Amino acid sequence: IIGGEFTTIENQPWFAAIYRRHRGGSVTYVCGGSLISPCWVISATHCFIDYPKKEDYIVYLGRSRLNSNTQGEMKFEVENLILHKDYSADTLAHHNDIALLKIRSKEGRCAQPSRTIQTIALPSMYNDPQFGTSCEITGFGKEQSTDYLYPEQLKMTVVKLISHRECQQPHYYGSEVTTKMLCAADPQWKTDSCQGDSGGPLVCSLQGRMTLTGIVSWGRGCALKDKPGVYTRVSHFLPWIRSHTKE
C-alpha cells in the first residue's frame, strides 16, 4: 500500500495472509485474501497460477504482521485451491482474476470469529456503490513501487471508485478495463495498492455493512497520475462464487 496508514488486523478482521512453502522449506508471502465464510477465503487467480498445488500454501487469519506472530492468529492448510478456468492476462488486463481457497486447520476446523477474525459480506448480484464512493483497501504490499521489502505491519488506505467512462479513457487504461473490473484511486493520486497487495479486499459500505466490492488485481505502476488500481468486480462473480462454494 502506497500512502495510507498502518493498522492492525482488528480493523480489517477478514484479511487473510497467504504464504507458500518453498521446496527446501523457506516460506514467503504470496498474496492477501478475504474471509467470506468460515471455510472460505477469496483472492486473485494470478497469485497462484504459477504454482497451483494447494499443498504448498498456508493461510493465516488474525495476523497483523508479515514475518512475526500475532496473538490470536490462526493457521490453516488449503483443502481446495480453486482458480478461475477462464483466467487470462493481456498486455495489462487480468481477466477473471478471482480464486477461492477452502481452509481448514490441521485439527479439521474452519475459522471461528473473534476480536481479530470475522467474515466480510458479499454484495448482492450486480450491487456496487456509486462512483465517487470512498472505499478502503488493505495489505502487506510495497509502500513504494521501487522498494524491495514489504512492510512488516499491515497497512490500509482509502481510495475512491472511478467511473468506467473515466477509467477507459485512452490516457488511463482504454479497453483493458472491462465491466467485470472496477477502478479506484486517490483524486490527487497520492495513495494506491502496489505489488504484494494482490488478492486483498476493496471494502465499501453497502446496506449498512462492510462489503467486499473488489479484489486487488492489477495496474500500471503504483500511485501514478491517470493510472488507477484495477480490481476484480465481485458483484459480477456471485454465481461462480456460489457454485464453487457448494457441496
Binding site: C31, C47, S198, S217, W218
Partner: peptide
C-alpha cells in the same frame, strides 16, 4: 508486469 501489471500483476499485483
Amino acid at each position: 508486469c501489471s500483476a499485483f
